[PDB]
Amino acid sequence: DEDETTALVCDNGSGLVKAGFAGDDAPRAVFPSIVGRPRHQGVMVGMGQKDSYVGDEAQSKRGILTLKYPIEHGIITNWDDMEKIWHHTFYNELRVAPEEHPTLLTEAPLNPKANREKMTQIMFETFNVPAMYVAIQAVLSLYASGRTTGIVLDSGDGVTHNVPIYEGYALPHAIMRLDLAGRDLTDYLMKILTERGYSFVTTAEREIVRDIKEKLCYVALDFENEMATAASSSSLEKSYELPDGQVITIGNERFRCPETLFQPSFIGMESAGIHETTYNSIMKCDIDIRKDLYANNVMSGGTTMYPGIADRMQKEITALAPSTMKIKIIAPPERKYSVWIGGSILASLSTFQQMWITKQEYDEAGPSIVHRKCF
Amino acid sequence: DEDETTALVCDNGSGLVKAGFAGDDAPRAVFPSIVGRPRHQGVMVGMGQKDSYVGDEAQSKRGILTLKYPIEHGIITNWDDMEKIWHHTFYNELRVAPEEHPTLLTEAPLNPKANREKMTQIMFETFNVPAMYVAIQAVLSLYASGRTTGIVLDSGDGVTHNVPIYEGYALPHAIMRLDLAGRDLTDYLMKILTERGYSFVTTAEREIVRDIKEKLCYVALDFENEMATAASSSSLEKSYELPDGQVITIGNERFRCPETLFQPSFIGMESAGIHETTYNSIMKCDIDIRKDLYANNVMSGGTTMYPGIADRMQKEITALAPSTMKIKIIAPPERKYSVWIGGSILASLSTFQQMWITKQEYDEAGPSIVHRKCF
Amino acid sequence: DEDETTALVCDNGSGLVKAGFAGDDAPRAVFPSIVGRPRHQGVMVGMGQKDSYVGDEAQSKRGILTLKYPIEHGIITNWDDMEKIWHHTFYNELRVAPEEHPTLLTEAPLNPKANREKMTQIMFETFNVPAMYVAIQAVLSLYASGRTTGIVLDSGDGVTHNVPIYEGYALPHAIMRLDLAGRDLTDYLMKILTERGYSFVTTAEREIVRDIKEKLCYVALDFENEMATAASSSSLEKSYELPDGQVITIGNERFRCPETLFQPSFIGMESAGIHETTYNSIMKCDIDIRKDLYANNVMSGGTTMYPGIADRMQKEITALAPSTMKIKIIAPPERKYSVWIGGSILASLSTFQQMWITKQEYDEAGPSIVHRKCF
Ligand SMILES: Nc1ncnc2c1ncn2[C@@H]1O[C@H](COP(=O)(O)OP(=O)(O)O)[C@@H](O)[C@H]1O
Ligand SMILES: Nc1ncnc2c1ncn2[C@@H]1O[C@H](COP(=O)(O)OP(=O)(O)O)[C@@H](O)[C@H]1O
Ligand SMILES: Nc1ncnc2c1ncn2[C@@H]1O[C@H](COP(=O)(O)OP(=O)(O)O)[C@@H](O)[C@H]1O
């Protein structure tokens, strides 16, 4: 609180907002992106509740609330709800006066121009920021990495991409999309557990299943052989206590759930699994740069956090590639916050501080400015 | 009683067993699935009563008895009780020697493998059937229909499903579940009648309320406008004589009870009403097959028997679908026995007689056989 | 069905088989070249479906099926699938007995010798044709035209060529290749529509986009000025109803998609646009024959069907050529079937009937015969 200034790095996630100050090593505020007020709301004797805050309160308030994601699949679809999320971010989580900070916002891949313009309009008109930037989330991640060359497999919450990069450039024609990512894997685990006679269907039960997924699932060494071991499997049958206190047993569901990344037909997806899309992406590049891609396969995103994933990707890529090809899979430790960190590096870039968009630019060429000939 | 043979078609319902001979047009035996013996049992001077027969005796014996459904929510949960129901089916209702007849059994959606194996074990070991098949009840219904394409709304006793079908295949990812169906509507009518100062709480009173529901409830043309007419409603106020002989008056409860299918929040269900699930199911299918689904919405199940339901579904679907979409609701007349009829067609399928499971198959690969690579 | 005979003219296209009788004015059978069976195949209650017929059934059966082209990029790559396509052609579409008809087959430019030999082996051994010929598809088209001199721009489904011709001879060193053609333009329209927030990614969605392309795209008068008019463009914003019934709006995508033929960098292609390749081809010819080429630029192929293409080519060629050069663009009306018609003329050539290849020639010098010293 003086001269200088930082850069409000707000990564608008499909399920979680990550926000903080440029220059910090990780976001200081992480809260669910949802909207929820009592679904039954039966009055009582007073009030003192906040209608649809969701954020952190919701979670801990599981069972009372309803949820909505105004950013459900990564694109913002409800501006009144998004204004509530940004107000919460600035005033309740970070506890800042937004008019004192240049703010860098992230946007999903394929975000419409008109959507970026509405984001810009709200920042300047509603929150009175002195400036702002919009950054592409994949791009920020790439930034955080620091690798000019290599092929990234980025699997997050709602989408997975394979992005080959040569000298810093995402050759746009090589990238392929997959709908599936963590949101789909949590829904599939709810369904397969419901196969055993359990019942996980409510909003609260979804949260419970997301926790089972993140704590007990793993990727097999070989799907077929893991299924065969399931028979005499005395390991798989882990126990998990529900908040009600009942204890369920989870066995082959531990590896059947994430097997979907390699076999999208488990959820009905025709798409090619992540090892096939990696190969298909490398084959859309020049033959010449393929050796550099094969030796620099970088994993990113929350859904690449499973133990065993790098070794499995090494095995599968080795099976598809030429016999003399050197293959290397890199996974950065704390991948998931790779998107926020790239934003932090960019926003905290004094040297490229002219890329931030300003109140004068917005007034001159409206918000589009932050879209036409920059970010 | 000679060569050839029929197929024992036993549809194990949550509230009613439907059983008969393959090839008959409808089941010859329909009896409540319950277990009940005197709750007070005060001896007397002799016996000559059957402990927990339930079946038909129970009903007519209302007030003395207790009830249990070993198939309460569609999945068999008590094998000693289920053995009693099957013994009653074979020896008391159909009056057959089970060792002379291949028998097709039905099972609920999501029935565990181990449950199908126990059903199979009992048929072969306890009843000595020469063969048997297990069939999926929804599937049998689909079979009875005869429509390859279209979206079915099947509302029965304990569950309601929306199932889109293209060329005979239930695209498994499109189907959505609802807990609510007729069991819930009877419980809700007991509760709302208890609001007027009446008291319907016992087992006998539940049966009385199920009769009021089936004889006097109806679905409104528009819920809001029907409530508004309730004021000057001189029609609604129908009379119903209780077995005690008192006469109650039923008015807006006639349409408030089934309104729950369209507004599950009446019983506290967050779920989306049946018109919303229909739309949500069609939107999980390819855009291309949607025109075929919209023109082939087939209603099935006992809870789709209300007069007015097809016209209301036509109105609601028309309001959600594109303006140029051709919408058609089909309701087969005697829907409820749609499940038994599909079983009868399948079981009575000489041409597919190799799908029946045999005593040799059970002995070789145990009962699982009737589960792994068939039904 | 008597003496004489016709010539089975089968044009094996990358996406469509065109087949018929020599002497007919157009092919009597046109069906997609694909292979597809249920991707989900969920059994049901019977069969009566044909595993991977594709042909016409597929299309109308959009959403159920998968596709494969055994001729994906013009060269046949799977002989078991190709045998199915030829069986369908003869027995289901044309309804002929192939052993009664000399059959002329077409092959892509640069088809390997061994591939032509395998085509020949199948015709004689599998279908028992009395004779057969293999013809080069470009060549057949040239044949259909009837112009000895001039430079043809032939843009079809998977490839575009510029072919200068002087007295009937394709000076082989002048011809240049382009990967891009209609297959690429349909893929690019799917991608650019997905930019607006729509989602066209499935096999069924590809077919939908191919229809939007063929019905609503057009080539601009000037790309830069058309983009500038897009702003106040109230024309562009045509509506298109999807099979689901939703209605999308298409605007600048109408001309951005085919702009790729003139600017291959839109899809990442370094190649020179079709006006530059025309000029580059004319400059590889003698200076002396250039006046004849400039006055005889003939358009051929499905991708030259856009309204406005001849006028745009006249404008662009005029801008590159010497000021006193007479420039004329010819487009034959029903260009697309230009390949089949050339085959029909050739095959129906009684006078050159000795060029057909016979069962004795195949037995003597194997199939190669139809390759070494003829077609
Ligand atoms: N340790 C972990 N193991 C597996 N999945 C994880 C782990 N940590 C986070 N995830 C999942 O990663 C997803 C979030 O990843 P993220 O990269 O932030 O996604 P997005 O950027 O698409 O919002 C969620 O589905 C979450 O459950
Ligand atoms: N005419 C009717 N009107 C309304 N509900 C009916 C009618 N006939 C039967 N039902 C109800 O339908 C339900 C039984 O339907 P059914 O399809 O057999 O269910 P399930 O297969 O789930 O056992 C019961 O709740 C019953 O009261
Ligand atoms: N009227 C049209 N306008 C634009 N493209 C068209 C038209 N008719 C056909 N096409 C396209 O032309 C291509 C087929 O042309 P064709 O000459 O048969 O190709 P090929 O011989 O390479 O198989 C397809 O991409 C198709 O969509």
Side-chain angles (χ1 to χ4, degrees):
Chain A
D1 37 23
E2 268 335 306
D3 200 274
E4 295 155 358
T5 201
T6 63
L8 271 220
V9 178
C10 187
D11 174 28
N12 304 301
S14 70
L16 297 173
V17 171
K18 282 73 61 176
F21 293 91
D24 291 354
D25 310 282
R28 292 198 221 163
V30 185
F31 63 86
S33 327
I34 306 179
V35 102
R37 122 200 62 223
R39 303 166 151 195
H40 272 111
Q41 186 173 355
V43 85
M44 61 194 99
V45 32
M47 271 223 297
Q49 102 136 284
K50 299 296 183 181
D51 241 290
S52 47
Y53 268 13
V54 157
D56 105 55
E57 246 139 306
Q59 315 190 305
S60 177
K61 216 165 232 208
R62 292 173 296 180
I64 186 167
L65 62 80
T66 143
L67 293 178
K68 261 243 80 87
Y69 307 73
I71 330 182
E72 190 166 20
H73 312 98
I75 287 168
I76 302 164
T77 67
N78 187 296
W79 297 108
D80 291 334
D81 295 340
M82 197 67 215
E83 180 181 337
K84 295 169 177 265
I85 287 174
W86 282 325
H87 175 95
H88 182 80
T89 302
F90 294 127
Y91 294 99
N92 302 151
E93 290 278 342
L94 298 179
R95 302 186 201 230
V96 298
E99 72 266 23
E100 301 175 349
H101 303 275
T103 296
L104 185 153
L105 303 176
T106 75
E107 66 173 28
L110 303 174
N111 191 42
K113 333 201 176 2
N115 189 295
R116 186 184 282 199
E117 293 177 350
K118 184 67 181 186
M119 299 168 67
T120 299
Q121 182 177 160
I122 291 166
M123 285 292 132
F124 282 125
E125 296 193 355
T126 301
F127 297 104
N128 198 30
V129 297
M132 31 84 53
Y133 201 59
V134 159
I136 294 159
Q137 305 163 324
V139 148
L140 297 177
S141 254
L142 221 77
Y143 193 165
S145 346
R147 285 149 235 317
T148 210
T149 256
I151 178 171
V152 169
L153 171 74
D154 182 334
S155 190
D157 192 64
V159 66
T160 296
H161 283 95
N162 313 88
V163 184
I165 292 149
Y166 196 80
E167 261 130 79
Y169 165 41
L171 325 111
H173 300 111
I175 317 146
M176 15 253 317
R177 290 237 317 236
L178 182 44
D179 218 279
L180 129 80
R183 79 193 18 175
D184 306 283
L185 295 195
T186 289
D187 292 343
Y188 183 56
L189 185 59
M190 297 173 73
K191 177 59 181 189
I192 68 177
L193 284 170
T194 301
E195 183 178 2
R196 278 209 215 245
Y198 300 134
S199 186
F200 292 96
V201 304
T202 66
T203 290
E205 288 158 0
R206 174 149 210 293
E207 290 309 311
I208 244 149
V209 177
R210 184 170 70 72
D211 192 53
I212 290 162
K213 182 194 77 167
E214 301 179 356
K215 285 177 177 167
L216 300 170
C217 287
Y218 66 97
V219 173
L221 196 33
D222 182 281
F223 181 79
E224 287 63 25
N225 284 35
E226 201 78 358
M227 302 290 348
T229 301
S232 22
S233 210
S234 49
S235 201
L236 56 51
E237 288 218 335
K238 298 267 182 208
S239 286
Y240 180 99
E241 186 182 343
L242 306 184
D244 89 311
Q246 298 190 100
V247 176
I248 57 168
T249 279
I250 188 166
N252 67 47
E253 301 88 347
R254 288 183 68 200
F255 62 89
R256 183 177 161 194
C257 168
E259 182 69 16
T260 307
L261 298 165
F262 298 89
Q263 299 202 56
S265 57
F266 282 20
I267 61 171
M269 235 134 200
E270 183 280 335
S271 35
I274 60 171
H275 57 303
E276 283 206 36
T277 61
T278 299
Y279 175 77
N280 291 343
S281 180
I282 290 171
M283 301 295 288
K284 285 184 166 298
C285 297
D286 254 279
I287 61 171
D288 287 5
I289 70 167
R290 301 179 186 158
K291 174 193 203 230
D292 296 327
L293 303 177
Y294 278 118
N296 291 283
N297 284 270
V298 179
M299 316 210 51
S300 64
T303 295
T304 69
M305 290 289 290
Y306 300 98
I309 204 173
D311 282 348
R312 173 65 177 283
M313 277 303 335
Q314 177 82 22
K315 164 190 180 216
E316 295 298 345
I317 301 305
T318 291
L320 292 163
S323 78
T324 174
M325 191 64 67
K326 174 170 186 287
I327 304 308
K328 185 185 204 270
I329 308 309
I330 298 99
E334 269 294 60
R335 212 6 150 175
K336 180 179 201 271
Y337 305 128
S338 68
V339 165
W340 185 95
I341 293 170
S344 181
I345 293 151
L346 211 61
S348 94
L349 261 207
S350 345
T351 53
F352 280 77
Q353 66 201 193
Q354 71 94 23
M355 293 294 301
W356 289 104
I357 275 17
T358 62
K359 171 66 149 163
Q360 186 167 254
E361 290 168 335
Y362 182 67
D363 284 338
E364 300 226 327
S368 75
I369 218 167
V370 101
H371 185 59
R372 234 41 255 149
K373 194 57 253 217
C374 37
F375 281 108
Chain B
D1 37 23
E2 268 335 306
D3 200 274
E4 295 155 358
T5 201
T6 63
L8 271 220
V9 178
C10 187
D11 174 27
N12 304 301
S14 70
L16 297 173
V17 171
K18 282 73 61 176
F21 293 91
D24 291 354
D25 310 282
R28 292 198 221 163
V30 185
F31 63 86
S33 327
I34 306 179
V35 102
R37 122 200 62 223
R39 303 166 151 195
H40 272 111
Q41 186 173 355
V43 85
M44 61 194 99
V45 32
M47 271 223 297
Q49 102 136 284
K50 299 296 183 181
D51 241 290
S52 47
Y53 268 13
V54 157
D56 105 55
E57 246 139 306
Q59 315 190 305
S60 177
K61 216 165 232 208
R62 292 173 296 180
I64 186 167
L65 62 80
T66 143
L67 293 178
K68 261 243 80 87
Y69 307 73
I71 330 182
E72 190 166 21
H73 312 98
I75 287 168
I76 302 163
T77 67
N78 187 296
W79 297 108
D80 291 334
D81 295 340
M82 197 67 215
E83 180 181 337
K84 295 169 177 265
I85 287 174
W86 282 324
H87 175 95
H88 182 80
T89 302
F90 294 127
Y91 294 99
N92 302 151
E93 290 278 342
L94 298 179
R95 301 186 201 230
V96 298
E99 72 266 23
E100 301 175 349
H101 303 275
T103 296
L104 185 153
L105 303 176
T106 75
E107 66 173 28
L110 303 174
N111 191 42
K113 333 201 176 2
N115 189 295
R116 186 185 282 199
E117 293 177 350
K118 184 67 181 186
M119 299 168 67
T120 299
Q121 182 177 160
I122 291 166
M123 285 292 132
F124 283 125
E125 296 193 355
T126 301
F127 297 104
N128 198 30
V129 297
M132 31 84 53
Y133 201 59
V134 159
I136 294 159
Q137 305 163 325
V139 148
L140 297 177
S141 254
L142 221 77
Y143 193 165
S145 346
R147 285 149 235 317
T148 210
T149 256
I151 178 171
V152 169
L153 171 74
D154 182 334
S155 190
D157 192 64
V159 66
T160 296
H161 283 95
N162 313 88
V163 184
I165 292 149
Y166 196 80
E167 261 130 78
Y169 165 41
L171 325 111
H173 300 111
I175 317 147
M176 15 253 317
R177 290 238 317 236
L178 182 44
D179 218 279
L180 129 80
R183 79 193 18 175
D184 306 283
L185 295 195
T186 289
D187 292 342
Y188 183 56
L189 185 59
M190 297 173 73
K191 177 59 181 190
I192 68 177
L193 284 170
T194 301
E195 183 178 2
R196 278 209 215 245
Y198 300 134
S199 186
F200 292 96
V201 304
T202 66
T203 290
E205 288 158 0
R206 174 149 210 293
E207 290 309 311
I208 244 149
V209 177
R210 184 170 70 72
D211 192 53
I212 290 162
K213 182 194 77 167
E214 301 179 356
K215 285 177 177 167
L216 299 170
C217 287
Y218 66 97
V219 173
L221 196 33
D222 182 281
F223 181 79
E224 287 63 25
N225 284 35
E226 201 78 358
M227 302 290 348
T229 301
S232 22
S233 210
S234 49
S235 201
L236 56 51
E237 288 218 335
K238 298 267 182 208
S239 286
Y240 180 99
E241 186 182 343
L242 306 184
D244 89 311
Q246 298 190 100
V247 176
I248 57 168
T249 279
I250 188 166
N252 67 47
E253 301 88 347
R254 288 183 68 200
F255 62 89
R256 183 177 161 194
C257 168
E259 182 69 16
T260 307
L261 298 165
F262 298 89
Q263 299 202 56
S265 57
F266 282 19
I267 61 171
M269 235 134 200
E270 183 280 335
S271 35
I274 60 171
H275 57 303
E276 282 206 36
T277 61
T278 299
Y279 175 77
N280 291 343
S281 180
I282 290 171
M283 301 295 288
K284 285 184 166 298
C285 297
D286 254 279
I287 61 171
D288 287 5
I289 70 167
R290 301 179 186 158
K291 174 193 203 231
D292 296 327
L293 303 177
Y294 278 118
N296 291 283
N297 284 270
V298 179
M299 316 210 51
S300 64
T303 295
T304 69
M305 290 289 290
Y306 300 98
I309 204 173
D311 282 348
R312 173 65 177 283
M313 277 303 335
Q314 177 82 22
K315 164 191 180 216
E316 295 298 345
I317 301 305
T318 291
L320 292 163
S323 78
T324 174
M325 191 64 67
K326 174 170 186 287
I327 304 308
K328 185 185 204 270
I329 308 309
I330 298 99
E334 269 294 60
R335 212 6 150 175
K336 180 179 202 271
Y337 305 128
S338 68
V339 165
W340 185 95
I341 293 170
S344 181
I345 293 151
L346 211 61
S348 94
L349 261 207
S350 345
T351 53
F352 280 77
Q353 66 201 193
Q354 71 94 23
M355 293 294 301
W356 289 104
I357 275 17
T358 62
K359 171 66 149 163
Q360 186 167 254
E361 290 168 335
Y362 182 67
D363 284 338
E364 300 226 327
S368 75
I369 218 167
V370 101
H371 185 59
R372 234 41 255 149
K373 194 57 253 217
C374 37
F375 281 108
Chain C
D1 37 23
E2 268 335 306
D3 200 274
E4 295 155 358
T5 201
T6 63
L8 271 220
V9 178
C10 187
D11 174 28
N12 304 301
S14 70
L16 297 173
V17 171
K18 282 73 61 176
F21 293 91
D24 291 354
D25 310 282
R28 292 198 221 163
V30 185
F31 63 86
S33 327
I34 306 179
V35 102
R37 122 200 62 223
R39 303 166 151 195
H40 272 111
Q41 186 173 355
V43 85
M44 60 194 99
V45 32
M47 271 223 297
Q49 102 136 284
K50 299 296 183 181
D51 241 290
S52 47
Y53 268 13
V54 157
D56 105 55
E57 246 139 306
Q59 315 190 305
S60 177
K61 216 165 232 208
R62 292 173 296 180
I64 186 167
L65 62 80
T66 143
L67 293 178
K68 261 243 80 87
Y69 307 73
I71 330 182
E72 190 166 21
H73 312 98
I75 287 168
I76 302 163
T77 67
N78 187 296
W79 297 108
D80 291 334
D81 295 340
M82 197 67 215
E83 180 181 337
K84 295 169 177 265
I85 287 174
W86 282 325
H87 175 95
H88 182 80
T89 302
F90 294 127
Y91 294 99
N92 302 151
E93 290 278 342
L94 297 179
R95 302 186 201 230
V96 298
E99 72 266 24
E100 300 175 349
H101 303 275
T103 296
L104 185 153
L105 303 176
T106 75
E107 66 173 28
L110 303 174
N111 191 42
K113 333 201 176 2
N115 189 295
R116 186 185 282 199
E117 293 177 350
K118 184 67 181 186
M119 299 168 67
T120 299
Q121 182 177 160
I122 291 166
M123 285 292 132
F124 283 125
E125 296 193 355
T126 301
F127 297 104
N128 197 30
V129 297
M132 31 84 53
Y133 201 59
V134 159
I136 294 159
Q137 305 163 325
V139 148
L140 297 177
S141 254
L142 221 77
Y143 192 165
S145 347
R147 285 149 235 317
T148 210
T149 256
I151 178 171
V152 169
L153 171 74
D154 182 334
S155 190
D157 192 64
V159 66
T160 296
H161 283 95
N162 313 88
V163 184
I165 292 149
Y166 196 80
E167 261 130 79
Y169 165 41
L171 325 111
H173 300 111
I175 317 146
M176 15 253 317
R177 290 237 317 236
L178 182 44
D179 218 279
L180 129 80
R183 79 193 18 175
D184 306 283
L185 295 195
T186 289
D187 292 342
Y188 183 56
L189 186 59
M190 297 173 73
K191 177 59 181 190
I192 68 177
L193 284 170
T194 301
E195 183 178 2
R196 278 209 215 245
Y198 300 134
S199 186
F200 292 96
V201 304
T202 66
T203 290
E205 288 158 0
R206 174 149 209 293
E207 290 309 311
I208 244 149
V209 177
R210 184 170 70 72
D211 192 53
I212 290 162
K213 182 194 77 167
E214 301 179 356
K215 285 177 177 167
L216 299 170
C217 287
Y218 66 97
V219 173
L221 196 33
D222 182 281
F223 181 79
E224 287 63 25
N225 284 35
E226 201 78 358
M227 302 290 348
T229 301
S232 22
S233 210
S234 49
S235 201
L236 56 51
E237 288 218 335
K238 298 267 182 208
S239 286
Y240 180 99
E241 186 182 343
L242 306 184
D244 89 312
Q246 298 190 100
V247 176
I248 57 168
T249 279
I250 188 166
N252 67 47
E253 301 88 347
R254 288 183 68 200
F255 62 89
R256 183 177 161 194
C257 168
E259 182 69 16
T260 307
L261 298 165
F262 298 89
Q263 299 202 56
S265 57
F266 282 19
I267 61 171
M269 235 134 200
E270 183 280 335
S271 35
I274 60 171
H275 57 303
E276 282 206 36
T277 61
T278 299
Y279 175 77
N280 291 343
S281 180
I282 290 171
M283 301 295 288
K284 285 184 166 298
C285 297
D286 254 279
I287 61 171
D288 287 5
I289 70 167
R290 301 179 186 158
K291 174 193 203 231
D292 296 327
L293 303 177
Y294 278 118
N296 291 283
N297 284 270
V298 179
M299 316 210 51
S300 64
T303 295
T304 69
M305 290 289 290
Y306 300 98
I309 205 173
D311 282 348
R312 173 65 177 283
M313 277 303 335
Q314 177 82 22
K315 164 191 180 216
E316 295 298 345
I317 301 306
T318 291
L320 292 163
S323 78
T324 174
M325 191 64 67
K326 174 170 186 287
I327 304 308
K328 185 185 204 270
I329 308 309
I330 298 99
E334 269 294 60
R335 212 6 150 175
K336 180 179 202 271
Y337 305 128
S338 68
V339 165
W340 185 95
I341 293 170
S344 181
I345 293 151
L346 211 60
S348 94
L349 261 207
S350 345
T351 53
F352 280 77
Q353 66 201 193
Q354 71 94 23
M355 293 294 301
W356 289 104
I357 275 17
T358 62
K359 171 66 149 163
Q360 186 167 254
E361 290 168 335
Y362 182 67
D363 284 338
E364 300 226 327
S368 75
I369 218 167
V370 101
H371 185 59
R372 234 41 255 149
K373 194 57 253 217
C374 37
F375 281 108

